[PDB]
């Protein structure tokens, strides 16, 4: 029994219908009882995943009313009926008909939202850091849609390179947005070296790179 | 129903990840469960590794790919069940779940309806390091409306995952603790910020609880504006 899904992933804006498809590679039918052993799970990152549909149709306690499950034994489909923006997850469907259980690969969940600019922030290294020997620039990207963003950082006009690192949020539960970190991250020394260090954000939600800066050592 | 999992941590190649759940709301010999441990890796995806069940006695079984290298067993005295997996090698890196099946009288299988909250176990040589907390202040460069962005900066710490909570709990709208970034020494580290109304500076007080469980590291840091000592003429 090897569980497919299709598709892979989805993005649809609030309010809309979502069907989410799984197949399992033989009958999870069982002749005696005429129940489909098949379960859905939503699972939010960092979360355990969640029950929402058992014996293919029956819905768990407490979960909303615009999850469904429906199926045929091999085919089986998982409704959302009008989405959410805390459905953003991953969705598995799962045989419990035969040794071993098995999980189907999941589908991920996306709302398609306005386009919103973020809100971009910088904040110097701490004075506790840079007695360490290390300072840390962080450039945050707040609150925006769609995900993709792209950041660079100049330090006193110069274009930096391969000594960044960033990483971007999982889609926010309540307003379906992203959010990003940059870190940029030279020795005290280096550091102490400039004056400007700028983080210059591209967004679609930005008529022009917005650029967020600071004079190290000035206030 | 309650499942509750021993902590992160990091176990040594060749050696024996050991975890608990420990179950509140129900027994662990309850005629109707039967107590499940799944992992769930990067690309082999949620993955079922064995159960154990008590019908008349005790029973065990596991999946093929940890035959023989598996225990799952029951603690009537603690209400608990552990899991130990032999011999583990890096590629053994995953979060481990707990959960319970449901069965009933004529039914012999049931869907997982109660989970553990996962415990992600780090294979490697690499002794733990616990991450220095840096504040991320609050200023003229993080404002925008009547809004103030603050955070805390967690860096150089191993294994993964380091915990971040505000005020012990009771601050979570508007926080972000983004996903751990890998830098080029082997170490992690990540920022958690959060916005709060840039009125209230004065009179709220943010602290940014972090805990490290795999090295028994915790830091609380209070995050505020940052004294001004600069500029020097004017």
């Known amino acids: 029994i090897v569980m497919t899904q299709s598709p892979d992933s989805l993005a649809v804006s609030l309010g809309e219908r979502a069907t989410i498809n799984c197949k399992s590679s033989q009958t999870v039918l069982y002749s005696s009882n005429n129940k489909k052993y098949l379960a859905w799970y939503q699972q939010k990152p960092g979360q355990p995943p969640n029950l929402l549909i058992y014996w293919a149709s029956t819905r768990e306690s407490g979960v909303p009313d615009r999850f469904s499950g429906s199926g045929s034994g091999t085919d089986f489909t998982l409704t959302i009926s009008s989405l959410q923006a805390e459905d953003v997850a991953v969705y598995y469907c799962?045989?419990?008909?035969?040794?071993?259980?098995?999980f189907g690969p999941g589908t991920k969940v996306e709302i398609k939202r306005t386009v919103a600019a973020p809100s971009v922030f910088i904040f110097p290294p701490s004075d506790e850091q840079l007695k360490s020997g290390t300072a840390s620039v962080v450039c945050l990207l707040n609150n925006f849609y769609p995900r993709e963003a792209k950041v660079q950082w100049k330090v006193d006009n110069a274009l930096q390179s391969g000594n960044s690192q960033e990483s971007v949020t999982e889609q926010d539960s309540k307003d379906s947005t992203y959010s990003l970190s940059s870190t940029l991250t030279l020795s005290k020394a280096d550091y102490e070296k400039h004056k400007v260090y700028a983080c210059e954000v591209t967004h679609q939600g930005l008529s022009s790179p917005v650029t967020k800066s600071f004079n190290r050592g000035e206030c | 129903v309650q499942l509750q999992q021993s902590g992160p941590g990091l176990v040594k190649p060749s050696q024996t990840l050991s975890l608990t759940c420990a179950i509140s709301?129900?027994?662990?010999?309850?005629?109707?469960?039967?107590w499940n441990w799944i992992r769930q890796s990067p690309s082999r995806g949620l993955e079922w590794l064995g159960k154990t069940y008590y019908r008349f006695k005790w029973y065990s079984d596991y999946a093929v790919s940890v035959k023989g290298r598996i225990t799952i067993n029951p603690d009537t005295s603690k209400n608990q069940f552990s899991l130990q997996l032999n011999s583990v090698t890096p590629e053994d890196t995953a979060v481990f779940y707990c959960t319970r099946e449901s069965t009933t009288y004529d039914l012999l299988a049931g869907p997982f309806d109660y989970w553990g909250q996962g415990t992600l176990v780090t294979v490697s040589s690499a002794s733990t390091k616990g991450p220095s907390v840096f504040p991320l202040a609050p200023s003229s460069k993080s404002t925008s409306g009547g809004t103030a962005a603050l955070g805390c900066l967690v860096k150089d710490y191993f294994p993964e995952p380091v915990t971040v909570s505000w005020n012990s709990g009771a601050l979570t709208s508007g926080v972000h603790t983004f996903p751990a970034v890998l830098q080029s020494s082997g170490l992690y580290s990540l920022s958690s910020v959060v916005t709060v109304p840039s009125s209230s500076l004065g009179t709220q007080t943010y602290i940014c609880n972090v805990n490290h469980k795999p090295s028994n590291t915790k830091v609380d840091k209070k995050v505020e504006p940052k004294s001004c000592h600069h500029h020097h003429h004017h």
């Open positions: 709301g129900d027994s662990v010999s309850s005629n109707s469960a039967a």
């Open positions: 799962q045989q419990y008909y035969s040794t071993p259980f098995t």
